Write a protein that holds these residues in place. Sequence first.
Motif, PDB file in Angstrom:
ATOM      1  N   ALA A 117       6.723  -7.648   5.104  1.00 35.76           N
ATOM      2  CA  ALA A 117       6.438  -7.059   3.788  1.00 35.76           C
ATOM      3  C   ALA A 117       6.162  -8.076   2.681  1.00 35.76           C
ATOM      4  O   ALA A 117       5.208  -7.888   1.930  1.00 35.76           O
ATOM      5  CB  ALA A 117       7.554  -6.103   3.375  1.00 35.76           C
ATOM      6  N   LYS A 118       6.962  -9.149   2.603  1.00 29.47           N
ATOM      7  CA  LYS A 118       6.840 -10.235   1.611  1.00 29.47           C
ATOM      8  C   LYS A 118       5.505 -10.969   1.749  1.00 29.47           C
ATOM      9  O   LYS A 118       4.840 -11.214   0.739  1.00 29.47           O
ATOM     10  CB  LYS A 118       8.030 -11.215   1.710  1.00 29.47           C
ATOM     11  CG  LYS A 118       9.334 -10.605   1.202  1.00 29.47           C
ATOM     12  CD  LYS A 118      10.568 -11.413   1.611  1.00 29.47           C
ATOM     13  CE  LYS A 118      11.277 -10.731   2.764  1.00 29.47           C
ATOM     14  NZ  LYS A 118      12.511 -11.435   3.174  1.00 29.47           N
ATOM     15  N   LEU A 137       2.649  -8.517   0.697  1.00 25.77           N
ATOM     16  CA  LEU A 137       2.527  -8.476  -0.763  1.00 25.77           C
ATOM     17  C   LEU A 137       1.783  -9.699  -1.314  1.00 25.77           C
ATOM     18  O   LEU A 137       0.886  -9.528  -2.138  1.00 25.77           O
ATOM     19  CB  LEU A 137       3.895  -8.302  -1.452  1.00 25.77           C
ATOM     20  CG  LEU A 137       3.895  -8.173  -2.995  1.00 25.77           C
ATOM     21  CD1 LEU A 137       2.895  -7.083  -3.481  1.00 25.77           C
ATOM     22  CD2 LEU A 137       5.282  -7.897  -3.509  1.00 25.77           C
ATOM     23  N   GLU A 179      -1.877  -9.430  -3.286  1.00 25.22           N
ATOM     24  CA  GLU A 179      -2.026  -9.925  -4.656  1.00 25.22           C
ATOM     25  C   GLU A 179      -3.031 -11.074  -4.763  1.00 25.22           C
ATOM     26  O   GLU A 179      -3.574 -11.305  -5.842  1.00 25.22           O
ATOM     27  CB  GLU A 179      -0.671 -10.275  -5.285  1.00 25.22           C
ATOM     28  CG  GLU A 179       0.218  -9.057  -5.472  1.00 25.22           C
ATOM     29  CD  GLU A 179       1.589  -9.292  -6.077  1.00 25.22           C
ATOM     30  OE1 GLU A 179       2.116 -10.422  -5.960  1.00 25.22           O
ATOM     31  OE2 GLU A 179       2.164  -8.322  -6.622  1.00 25.22           O
TER      32      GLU A 179
END
Lengths: 155, 156
Positions: free
Chosen positions: A45-46, A49, A53
């Motif tokens: 998930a990190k 993200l 971005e």
Amino acid sequence: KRLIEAAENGNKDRVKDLLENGADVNASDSDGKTPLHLAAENGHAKVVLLLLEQGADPNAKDSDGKTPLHLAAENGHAVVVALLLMHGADPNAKDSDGKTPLHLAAENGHEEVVILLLAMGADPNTSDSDGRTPLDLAREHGNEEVVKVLEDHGG
Amino acid sequence: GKRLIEAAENGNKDRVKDLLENGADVNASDSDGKTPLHLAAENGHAKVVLLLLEQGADPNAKDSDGKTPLHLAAENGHAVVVALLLMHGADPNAKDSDGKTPLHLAAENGHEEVVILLLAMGADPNTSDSDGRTPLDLAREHGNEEVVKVLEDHGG
């Protein structure tokens, strides 16, 4: 190249430094796999993200017609699915088998993923290459909660 | 309205749907300012949360403690509920009576997945509560190391 292997093992620090060195956020493997496909598939998930971005395409198709959303949905990575949806991932994108992320989540009994996809406008009545809907796959899986969820959304 | 609040709290989706069809207000409030969406989000009833949101429930309705359904879901670590609320426009920077945002509550209780979702939706990692504390200060205080790192990486 190195960015793909770094997103695959969930090495955020190595991902961060490779893009700082100028690595393409949308770099593709011979199988059409991008760093976002592998981080999404593996539930990092990190990393997902950071890639999103930095401009990673949530709708990039691999050689199987699968987007990072197909891979995350299939593996039941709910947080990853939510991150992809937030960044414009198409919940109705069809792979080479005509399966949408909803077909893959229903087949593997991922209730939370099914809920998130339906909330973002995934069609519960899309037919795959065999003419089967996500509801047909949920009934074949047997998780009655997923079956019920799809039935309640007009399935 | 009262029957809708208790049904939403119980996670009884069929009873919730039946009450809305009978004319129950989606935005009905208790004496404590708690709406059906506050209780369904607090109790982690994602399916009920989705039905309420699509029927017009306000994701930013404030209870008597200044808490929105997002504050309650974030505090309890209900990741899917948090994502559903964010999708429907819940403010990740809304302050409760203690000046705490959903990020402060998630960080205080060590809910890493909720923290990630809030940051993704523009939650400010440096907002100060009433005591001048940031979500990082609260993540540190309660020994939440995984949350501490995530906040530090997002400019905390």
